[PDB]
């Protein structure tokens, strides 16, 4: 085979992750994987120093940016958070922030004509396709760590299979009868 | 690949036969398909499957 250099501008290497507490353990490993592979991942645990100044501003910074790719870490608790987080017996602040992020994602999705340009649902080990929010089911759903190569390709914004340029037409022959 | 030449004519929207004459595509003929580069790849994949 042959090797191709990755020419993605650095600003496009930015990535933001939204998740729930049940996934936090696996999400740490996922961020390790992304950072090792050159992607600048923005997740609250590593950003707590800057995120603590103003949580809502920190979230809005990544939600505004169109060039930032958002990864949705699906899990059984994620659906509960994005649907009825406030209905819980106690107030889960992270659950509420996840719900707010989900609402902002949905609003942006609708504004764009229901075109999902930058939301990448990822099913984490203890997740099932039913837990994916309905509107996200309309795009590719990756399963971690099974499809991590495809996740990297999606983040790099490259197609796994690339067609060659349209080839020449064949020879046309005439035979008398 | 047993009638692919007809398939390519359907794609091109051309009749294969006409009064007193016949139309053919040399490369896409069965044997020529086998001899073609991409044809060999398709043949290998089909044999594998």
């Amino acid at each position: 085979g042959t090797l191709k250099t990755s020419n993605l501008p650095e600003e496009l290497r930015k990535v933001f992750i939204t998740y729930s507490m049940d996934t936090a353990m696996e999400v740490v490993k996922f961020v390790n994987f992304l950072l090792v592979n050159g992607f600048q991942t923005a997740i609250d645990i590593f950003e707590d120093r800057i995120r603590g100044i103003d949580i809502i501003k920190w979230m809005e910074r990544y939600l505004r940016d169109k060039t930032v790719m958002i990864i949705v870490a699906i899990s059984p608790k994620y659906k509960q958070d994005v649907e009825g987080a406030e209905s819980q017996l106690d107030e889960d602040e992270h659950g509420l922030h996840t719900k707010y992020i989900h609402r902002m994602m949905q609003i942006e999705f609708i504004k764009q004509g229901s075109m999902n340009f930058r939301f990448i649902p990822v099913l984490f080990p203890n997740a099932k396709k039913e837990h994916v929010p309905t509107w996200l089911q309309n795009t590719h759903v990756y399963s971690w760590p099974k499809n991590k190569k495809n996740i990297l390709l999606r983040l790099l914004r490259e197609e796994e299979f690339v067609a060659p340029p349209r080839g020449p037409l064949p020879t046309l022959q005439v035979v008398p009868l | 690949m047993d009638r692919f030449e007809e398939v390519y004519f359907r794609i091109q929207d051309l009749e294969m036969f006409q009064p007193g004459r016949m139309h053919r595509v040399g490369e896409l003929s069965g044997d020529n398909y086998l001899r073609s580069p991409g044809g060999r790849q398709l043949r290998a994949a089909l044999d594998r499957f």
Binding site: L169, P170, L172, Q173, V174 | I11, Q12, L14, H23
Partner: peptide, 9 residues
Amino acid sequence: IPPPLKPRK
């Protein structure tokens, strides 16, 4: 006489 081929999708 062979007709002219054209690219197709």
